[PDB]
Design a protein around this nucleic acid. Structure first.
Ligand SMILES: [K+]
Ligand SMILES: [K+]
Ligand SMILES: [K+]
Ligand SMILES: [K+]
Ligand SMILES: [K+]
Ligand SMILES: [K+]
Ligand SMILES: [K+]
Ligand SMILES: [K+]
Ligand SMILES: [K+]
Ligand SMILES: [K+]
Ligand SMILES: [K+]
Ligand SMILES: [Mg+2]
Ligand SMILES: [Mg+2]
Ligand SMILES: [Mg+2]
Ligand SMILES: [Mg+2]
Ligand SMILES: [Mg+2]
Ligand SMILES: [Mg+2]
Ligand SMILES: [Mg+2]
Ligand SMILES: [Mg+2]
Ligand SMILES: [Mg+2]
Ligand SMILES: [Mg+2]
Ligand SMILES: [Mg+2]
Ligand SMILES: [Mg+2]
Ligand SMILES: [Mg+2]
Ligand SMILES: [Mg+2]
Ligand SMILES: [Mg+2]
Ligand SMILES: [Mg+2]
Ligand SMILES: [Mg+2]
Ligand SMILES: [Mg+2]
Ligand SMILES: [Mg+2]
Ligand SMILES: [Mg+2]
Ligand SMILES: [Mg+2]
Ligand SMILES: [Mg+2]
Ligand SMILES: [Mg+2]
Ligand SMILES: [Mg+2]
Ligand SMILES: [Mg+2]
Ligand SMILES: [Mg+2]
Ligand SMILES: [Mg+2]
Ligand SMILES: [Mg+2]
Ligand SMILES: [Mg+2]
Ligand SMILES: [Mg+2]
Ligand SMILES: [Mg+2]
Ligand SMILES: [Mg+2]
Ligand SMILES: [Mg+2]
Ligand SMILES: [Mg+2]
Ligand SMILES: [Mg+2]
Ligand SMILES: [Mg+2]
Ligand SMILES: [Mg+2]
Ligand SMILES: [Mg+2]
Ligand SMILES: [Mg+2]
Ligand SMILES: [Mg+2]
Ligand SMILES: [Mg+2]
Lengths: 119, 73, 101, 88
RNA sequence: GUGGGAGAGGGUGGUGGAAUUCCCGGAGUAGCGGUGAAAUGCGCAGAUACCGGGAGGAACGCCGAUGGCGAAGGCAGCCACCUGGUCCACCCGUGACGCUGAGGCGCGAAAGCGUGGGGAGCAAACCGGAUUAGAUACCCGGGUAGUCCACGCCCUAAACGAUGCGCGCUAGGUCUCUGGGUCUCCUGGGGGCCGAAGCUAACGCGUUAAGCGCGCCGCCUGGGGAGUACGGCCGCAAGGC
C-alpha cells in the first residue's frame, strides 16, 4: 500500500510467456504477474489466454494499491500480446494510452544461431 | 501503393543539404524517427542520398531523433 | 585554406557570465588554429530530439570559417576539451543543393 | 593534394614552348609529381594497397613515355631525366 | 590539358545513437528461462519484468534498391585529413608513344599460424539436458580456441557471370544509375530485362555476345587410381604450387 491511482503497465510478450509489470509514474514496480504467477507451467505460459489471466492478476493486485488509470507500454512480439492489452482495458483500469517500445538494435550483437540470417 | 502525398509535394523550396532546418527535415521521418522511403519522400535517387546524409548529421547534433516510440497499438 | 562550418553545442544552464567564458575559449582557440571567422549564428538554446549529457536541451553555436586543413582535426580535439562543450561537428562547407525549385 | 598553381608552375617549367600541355616532357613531369606525392603518402599509410595499385600504374605510364623519348630523341631524353631526377 | 560530376574505392585519426552483457542504486516478488513436450540452468545471498547511473566489447537499424565503387578478394553510422580509379564537355597540347603478356613483383574472403593486446555477444572442441532402436547429430542450457585490434605469416575457395584481356563490325524495345544538350527528346559512360540477324547439343546467348572477325596469354585431351606418390620449390606449422 501507498496509494498511486495512476501509473504504468508494462507488457513483455514472448513466444514463451507474457509478463505484466505495473509501476508508479516514475517506473517503479508496484505489482506484477505472468503465466507462471498464475497456475500455468510449461508451454501454456505463452498462450494468449494465460496472458489475459496474467494481465488481470496484475490489474487487480494494482487496485489494492488503489490505482485507477495507466499508460500501457508494450514490448515484444508474442502470441498473447494483444490479449494483454484488451485484458487491461476491460478491467476497471483506464487505459489512457498504448505504446509499443520493443527494443531493436541498429545491428549490434550477433544473434544466437537460432535467430540468425539477421543481425 | 502509399498514395498519401509525397513529402516533396507538401512542401516547396529547401536546401536538401541544410542539416539544421529541423522544421523541414523533420518531415522526412516516420511516426518513428526513421528516414522515409523514396516511396513517401517523393525525392529521387540523388536527392534522397543527400537527404539521408543530412538527416544523420542532424541526429548527431541532437536536432533530430534516431528512434521514437510508436503511439497507439 | 578551406571553408568549414564549426557546430558547437553547449550546456543550456550557463549564466550569461559563464556562457561568455566558453565562447572566449572558442575564440582564443580558433585563432590558434588559423580560424578566420567569416560569420556566426548564436542560435541559442534549443529542445534536443533526445537528451544529450543528461540535459534535455543545448545551447547552439555556428561559425563559418576558413583555415589550414591539416589543423581541422587538431582544432576539434581542443574544442572538445571544455566541459560545457558537449558537441563539436566541423563540416566542409558546401553549396546548397536546392530541391523542388 | 595538388593545386592548379603547382600543376601550372610545373607545366610551364617543362613545356617545349608556350601552350605545350600534352608533350612527352610535360606528361613525365606531371606523373613524376603525382608519383612523388603518392610515394610520400605510402611511407605513412603503407597498408593502403588500393592506392598503391595507382602508384604502379603511374610508374608504368612514366616508363613507357620515357622509353618513347629515349628512342625518338636520346637528347631530350637525358635532358628531361637529369632535370627531374629520375632513374635513381 | 582546362572545366565539371557521381560513388559503401583505399588508409589514419576522431566521434554518435540503438541493443546485448556485467556492475551499482531504487522499486518489487516467485518465478524466469526454454521446447513438440520437457529437462539441464538461473532465482528468497531476491532472479525475471520496470526505472536511474556506470563500464566495456563488437556491429552499424531506417535510408537501402531491382542502387553504387573497386582489378579481384571486397567495400555500408557520422566527421576531418591523406590517397587511387573513373565518367562527361571543350577539340586545346603530344604525335602510334599501341594491344597482349611466359617468368618476376604486388594484392588476395573465411578458416588457420606466430607475438602482444582485447573479450560484450556469438561459438569448433568440450561439459551437461532432451530425443532415438542407438544419437559420438539434429533441439535446449553452458562454453575454450576463435570471432575483434596491431604487427608478421598463410595464399585457399562454388576466389562464379562456373564466361581471360583489347579493338573493330552486326535491328530494335523497355527499366534504371551518373554526365552533357537546342532538355516531349537527343547524346556519352555503367547496371538490368525482352528480343533482329546470327550462334548453340540443348538450355540458352544476343551492342554488357555465347554473333561476325584480328592480336596475345592461360588451359583441356575418357572414368577410377589421385590432386594421391616421388622429386623440387615455398611455409613456423597446418599445408600450398
Ligand atoms: K532538386
Ligand atoms: K546490387
Ligand atoms: K591449434
Ligand atoms: K578482420
Ligand atoms: K598477409
Ligand atoms: K539531363
Ligand atoms: K534452337
Ligand atoms: K532457364
Ligand atoms: K612433395
Ligand atoms: K620447412
Ligand atoms: K598452405
Ligand atoms: Mg514457456
Ligand atoms: Mg577533371
Ligand atoms: Mg568507401
Ligand atoms: Mg548502452
Ligand atoms: Mg538492483
Ligand atoms: Mg531491494
Ligand atoms: Mg535449484
Ligand atoms: Mg527469505
Ligand atoms: Mg546474490
Ligand atoms: Mg537482467
Ligand atoms: Mg539499466
Ligand atoms: Mg570486460
Ligand atoms: Mg567493374
Ligand atoms: Mg561477390
Ligand atoms: Mg579522386
Ligand atoms: Mg588538337
Ligand atoms: Mg604537329
Ligand atoms: Mg588471406
Ligand atoms: Mg581471419
Ligand atoms: Mg591469433
Ligand atoms: Mg591472443
Ligand atoms: Mg584476457
Ligand atoms: Mg551461448
Ligand atoms: Mg541417450
Ligand atoms: Mg549450444
Ligand atoms: Mg556467383
Ligand atoms: Mg546497326
Ligand atoms: Mg538496353
Ligand atoms: Mg547501355
Ligand atoms: Mg543507358
Ligand atoms: Mg549492378
Ligand atoms: Mg532467330
Ligand atoms: Mg529444344
Ligand atoms: Mg538476352
Ligand atoms: Mg566483341
Ligand atoms: Mg592445369
Ligand atoms: Mg586415367
Ligand atoms: Mg586409363
Ligand atoms: Mg586423371
Ligand atoms: Mg589440396
Ligand atoms: Mg618455412
Amino acid at each position: 500500500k501507498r496509494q498511486v491511482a495512476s501509473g504504468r503497465a508494462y507488457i513483455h510478450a514472448s513466444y514463451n510467456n507474457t509478463i505484466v509489470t505495473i509501476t508508479d509514474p516514475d517506473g517503479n514496480p508496484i505489482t506484477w504477474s505472468s503465466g507462471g504467477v498464475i497456475g500455468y507451467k510449461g508451454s501454456r505460459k505463452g498462450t494468449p489466454y494465460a496472458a489475459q489471466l496474467a494481465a488481470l492478476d496484475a490489474a487487480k493486485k494494482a487496485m489494492a494499491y488503489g490505482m485507477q488509470s495507466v499508460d500501457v507500454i508494450v514490448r515484444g512480439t508474442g502470441a498473447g500480446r494483444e490479449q494483454a492489452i484488451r485484458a487491461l482495458q476491460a478491467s476497471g483500469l483506464q487505459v489512457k494510452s498504448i505504446v509499443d517500445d520493443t527494443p531493436v538494435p541498429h545491428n549490434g550483437c550477433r544473434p544466437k544461431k537460432k535467430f540468425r540470417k539477421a543481425s | 501503393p502509399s498514395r498519401k502525398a509525397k513529402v516533396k509535394a507538401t512542401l516547396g523550396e529547401f536546401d536538401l543539404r541544410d542539416y539544421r532546418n529541423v522544421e523541414v527535415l523533420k518531415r522526412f521521418l516516420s511516426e518513428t524517427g526513421k528516414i522515409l522511403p523514396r516511396r513517401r519522400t517523393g525525392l529521387s535517387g540523388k536527392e534522397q542520398r543527400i537527404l539521408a546524409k543530412t538527416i544523420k548529421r542532424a541526429r548527431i547534433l541532437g536536432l533530430l531523433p534516431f528512434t521514437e516510440k510508436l503511439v497507439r497499438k | 585554406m578551406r571553408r568549414y562550418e564549426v557546430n558547437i553545442v553547449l550546456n543550456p544552464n550557463l549564466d550569461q557570465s559563464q556562457l561568455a567564458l566558453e565562447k572566449e575559449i572558442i575564440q582564443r582557440a580558433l585563432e590558434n588554429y588559423g580560424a578566420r571567422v567569416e560569420k556566426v549564428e548564436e542560435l541559442g538554446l534549443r529542445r534536443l530530439a533526445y537528451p544529450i549529457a543528461k540535459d534535455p536541451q543545448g545551447y547552439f553555436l555556428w561559425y563559418q570559417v576558413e583555415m589550414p586543413e591539416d589543423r581541422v582535426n587538431d582544432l576539434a580535439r581542443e574544442l572538445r576539451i571544455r566541459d560545457n562543450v558537449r558537441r563539436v561537428m566541423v563540416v566542409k562547407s558546401q553549396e546548397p543543393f536546392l530541391a523542388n525549385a | 593534394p595538388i593545386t592548379k598553381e603547382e600543376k601550372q608552375k610545373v607545366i610551364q617549367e617543362f613545356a617545349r614552348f608556350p601552350g605545350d600541355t600534352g608533350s612527352t616532357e610535360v606528361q613525365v613531369a606531371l606523373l613524376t609529381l603525382r608519383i612523388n606525392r603518392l610515394s610520400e603518402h605510402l611511407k605513412v599509410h603503407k597498408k593502403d594497397h588500393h592506392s598503391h595499385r595507382g602508384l604502379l600504374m603511374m610508374v608504368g605510364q612514366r616508363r613507357r613515355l620515357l622509353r618513347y623519348l629515349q628512342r625518338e630523341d636520346p637528347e631530350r631524353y637525358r635532358a628531361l631525366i637529369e632535370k627531374l631526377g629520375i632513374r635513381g
